[PDB]
Design an enzyme around this catalytic site. Sequence first.
Site, PDB file in Angstrom:
ATOM      1  N   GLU A  94      24.339  12.047   9.296  1.00 29.55           N
ATOM      2  CA  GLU A  94      25.129  11.129  10.124  1.00 29.55           C
ATOM      3  C   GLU A  94      26.394  10.663   9.391  1.00 29.55           C
ATOM      4  O   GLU A  94      27.306  10.079   9.997  1.00 29.55           O
ATOM      5  CB  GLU A  94      24.290   9.917  10.552  1.00 29.55           C
ATOM      6  CG  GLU A  94      23.167  10.267  11.569  1.00 29.55           C
ATOM      7  CD  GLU A  94      21.882  10.882  10.925  1.00 29.55           C
ATOM      8  OE1 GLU A  94      21.028  10.105  10.494  1.00 29.55           O
ATOM      9  OE2 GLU A  94      21.704  12.116  10.782  1.00 29.55           O
ATOM     10  N   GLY A 120       2.794   6.182   8.523  1.00 28.29           N
ATOM     11  CA  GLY A 120       4.200   6.463   8.264  1.00 28.29           C
ATOM     12  C   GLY A 120       5.114   5.291   8.590  1.00 28.29           C
ATOM     13  O   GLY A 120       6.221   5.196   8.083  1.00 28.29           O
ATOM     14  N   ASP A 147      -0.409  -7.460   1.856  1.00 27.50           N
ATOM     15  CA  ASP A 147       0.187  -6.103   1.858  1.00 27.50           C
ATOM     16  C   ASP A 147       1.697  -6.200   2.014  1.00 27.50           C
ATOM     17  O   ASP A 147       2.281  -6.066   3.129  1.00 27.50           O
ATOM     18  CB  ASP A 147      -0.414  -5.245   2.995  1.00 27.50           C
ATOM     19  CG  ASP A 147      -0.122  -3.764   2.837  1.00 27.50           C
ATOM     20  OD1 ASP A 147       0.455  -3.347   1.791  1.00 27.50           O
ATOM     21  OD2 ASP A 147      -0.458  -3.017   3.786  1.00 27.50           O
ATOM     22  N   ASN A 159      18.566  10.061  11.974  1.00 21.96           N
ATOM     23  CA  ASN A 159      17.835  11.269  12.202  1.00 21.96           C
ATOM     24  C   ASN A 159      17.491  11.857  10.845  1.00 21.96           C
ATOM     25  O   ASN A 159      18.379  12.195  10.074  1.00 21.96           O
ATOM     26  CB  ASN A 159      18.677  12.216  13.079  1.00 21.96           C
ATOM     27  CG  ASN A 159      17.945  13.490  13.456  1.00 21.96           C
ATOM     28  OD1 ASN A 159      17.262  14.090  12.631  1.00 21.96           O
ATOM     29  ND2 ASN A 159      18.163  13.966  14.698  1.00 21.96           N
ATOM     30  N   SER A 214       4.198   2.088   7.978  1.00 17.62           N
ATOM     31  CA  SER A 214       3.923   0.993   7.061  1.00 17.62           C
ATOM     32  C   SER A 214       5.171   0.549   6.304  1.00 17.62           C
ATOM     33  O   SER A 214       5.976   1.333   5.875  1.00 17.62           O
ATOM     34  CB  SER A 214       2.843   1.376   6.068  1.00 17.62           C
ATOM     35  OG  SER A 214       1.602   1.399   6.750  1.00 17.62           O
ATOM     36  N   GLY A 215       5.288  -0.747   6.109  1.00 20.32           N
ATOM     37  CA  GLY A 215       6.447  -1.263   5.385  1.00 20.32           C
ATOM     38  C   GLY A 215       7.588  -1.601   6.309  1.00 20.32           C
ATOM     39  O   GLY A 215       8.483  -2.341   5.929  1.00 20.32           O
ATOM     40  N   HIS A 218       0.812  -1.235   0.000  1.00 22.79           N
ATOM     41  CA  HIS A 218       0.000   0.000   0.000  1.00 22.79           C
ATOM     42  C   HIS A 218       0.853   1.297   0.000  1.00 22.79           C
ATOM     43  O   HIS A 218       0.337   2.366  -0.277  1.00 22.79           O
ATOM     44  CB  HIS A 218      -1.007  -0.015   1.185  1.00 22.79           C
ATOM     45  CG  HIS A 218      -0.487   0.510   2.504  1.00 22.79           C
ATOM     46  ND1 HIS A 218      -0.244  -0.317   3.586  1.00 22.79           N
ATOM     47  CD2 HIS A 218      -0.293   1.770   2.953  1.00 22.79           C
ATOM     48  CE1 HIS A 218       0.159   0.406   4.618  1.00 22.79           C
ATOM     49  NE2 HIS A 218       0.129   1.678   4.273  1.00 22.79           N
ATOM     50  N   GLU A 228      24.338   7.645   5.781  1.00 25.91           N
ATOM     51  CA  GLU A 228      23.160   7.427   4.885  1.00 25.91           C
ATOM     52  C   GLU A 228      23.626   6.948   3.527  1.00 25.91           C
ATOM     53  O   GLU A 228      24.667   7.395   3.056  1.00 25.91           O
ATOM     54  CB  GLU A 228      22.388   8.749   4.751  1.00 25.91           C
ATOM     55  CG  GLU A 228      21.830   9.285   6.101  1.00 25.91           C
ATOM     56  CD  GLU A 228      22.791  10.214   6.870  1.00 25.91           C
ATOM     57  OE1 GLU A 228      24.011  10.188   6.612  1.00 25.91           O
ATOM     58  OE2 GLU A 228      22.235  10.957   7.682  1.00 25.91           O
TER      59      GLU A 228
HETATM   60  C1  LIG Z   1       0.458   2.817   5.132  1.00 27.54           C
HETATM   61  C2  LIG Z   1       0.875   2.563   6.582  1.00 27.54           C
HETATM   62  O1  LIG Z   1       1.740   3.675   6.990  1.00 27.54           O
HETATM   63  C3  LIG Z   1      -0.258   2.609   7.563  1.00 27.54           C
HETATM   64  C4  LIG Z   1       0.196   1.952   8.879  1.00 27.54           C
HETATM   65  C5  LIG Z   1      -0.951   2.063   9.943  1.00 27.54           C
HETATM   66  C6  LIG Z   1      -0.684   1.085  11.148  1.00 27.54           C
HETATM   67  N1  LIG Z   1      -1.715   1.426  12.117  1.00 27.54           N
HETATM   68  C7  LIG Z   1      -1.597   0.828  13.441  1.00 27.54           C
HETATM   69  N2  LIG Z   1      -2.632   1.216  14.357  1.00 27.54           N
HETATM   70  N3  LIG Z   1      -0.639  -0.049  13.771  1.00 27.54           N
HETATM   71  N4  LIG Z   1      -1.356   1.874   7.020  1.00 27.54           N
HETATM   72  C8  LIG Z   1      -2.602   2.510   6.675  1.00 27.54           C
HETATM   73  O2  LIG Z   1      -2.711   3.717   6.884  1.00 27.54           O
HETATM   74  C9  LIG Z   1      -3.733   1.668   6.065  1.00 27.54           C
HETATM   75  N5  LIG Z   1      -5.005   2.245   6.332  1.00 27.54           N
HETATM   76  C10 LIG Z   1      -5.467   2.154   7.648  1.00 27.54           C
HETATM   77  O3  LIG Z   1      -4.807   1.684   8.551  1.00 27.54           O
HETATM   78  C11 LIG Z   1      -6.854   2.751   7.923  1.00 27.54           C
HETATM   79  N6  LIG Z   1      -7.614   1.798   8.645  1.00 27.54           N
HETATM   80  C12 LIG Z   1      -6.682   3.975   8.797  1.00 27.54           C
HETATM   81  C13 LIG Z   1      -6.131   5.126   7.935  1.00 27.54           C
HETATM   82  C14 LIG Z   1      -5.864   6.269   8.905  1.00 27.54           C
HETATM   83  O4  LIG Z   1      -6.296   6.169  10.101  1.00 27.54           O
HETATM   84  O5  LIG Z   1      -5.216   7.297   8.547  1.00 27.54           O
HETATM   85 CA   LIG Z   2      20.272  11.603   8.817  1.00 31.51          CA
END
Ligand SMILES: *C[C@@](*)(O)[C@H](CCCNC(N)=[NH2+])NC(=O)CNC(=O)[C@@H](N)CCC(=O)O
Ligand SMILES: [Ca+2]
Lengths: 235, 51
Positions: free
Chosen positions: A62, A183, A89, A57, A185-186, A41, A65
Amino acid sequence: IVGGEDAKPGQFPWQVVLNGKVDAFCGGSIVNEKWIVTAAHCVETGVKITVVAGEHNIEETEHTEQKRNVIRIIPHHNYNAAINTYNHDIALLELDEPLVLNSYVTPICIADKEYTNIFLKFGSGYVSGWGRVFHKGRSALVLQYLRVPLVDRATCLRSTKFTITNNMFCAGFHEGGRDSCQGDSGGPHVTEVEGTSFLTGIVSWGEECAMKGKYGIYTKVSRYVNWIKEKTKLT
Amino acid sequence: CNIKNGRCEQFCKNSADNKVVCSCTEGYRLAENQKSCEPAVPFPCGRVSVS
Ligand SMILES: *C[C@@](*)(O)[C@H](CCCNC(N)=[NH2+])NC(=O)CNC(=O)[C@@H](N)CCC(=O)O
Ligand SMILES: [Ca+2]
């Protein structure tokens, strides 16, 4: 990461950050000198993306990088087979030039399907990233990390109206307060096995961040390790 | 491999005669004690070397 702590430099040398039309928009981990694994995603569409390894940072230098361009993106072939589910995902990014491995730039280990699941079921993993440090709040300048417990499937299912597939797992705390977030994710969920860390999950989704009664949802990497190995071969 | 992973530091497979064979992931070699995993490259995966 909500409720975590600052990493030390080199503590998560497999962690990378992704930059694009948005800076520091997702994380990833190093599979090998040419390949990063992240969340699908994060990399829908073929917008241009760059990877920074050896990052600590994101507002300072540093001199550790390593910046690379992404020349090929392979989302899992079943991602988005069903709309808006976050099932499968996971995605791979090929770099234009090999990373140079060192203490700050080191791959994460990836076990076979059986042992990846065995490691996950040890029940305690580390997650890391530069995502939001409060739900709907600012992003981190210094890499954050957090230990999260595995959550039993039944509890997991009862926590949300959304579908948790067998390609996912839940992790976090019953009282809330500590979680990954937008932020992140991944970023890698990793399990430490006698000093050697293995990839066991990828930060994928949740409902808000760090709310009591809710958990972070992660891509279950054991289901995808055969695919990761097939697509990232060096020659 | 039943208890304590057969004493393998990383991977265990049951062989025969209730014995085990340990193995390790890429970048490591099975140590001569036939259980532990030793680094076989300068920066093996999954380890902190800054400290
Ligand atoms: C794309 C990735 O950065 C985020 C990670 C969210 C992890 N959330 C938790 N509580 N561990 N993934 C998303 O934003 C995918 N969409 C959702 O999670 C939606 N259900 C919420 C979108 C939102 O609240 O901004
Ligand atoms: Ca840096």
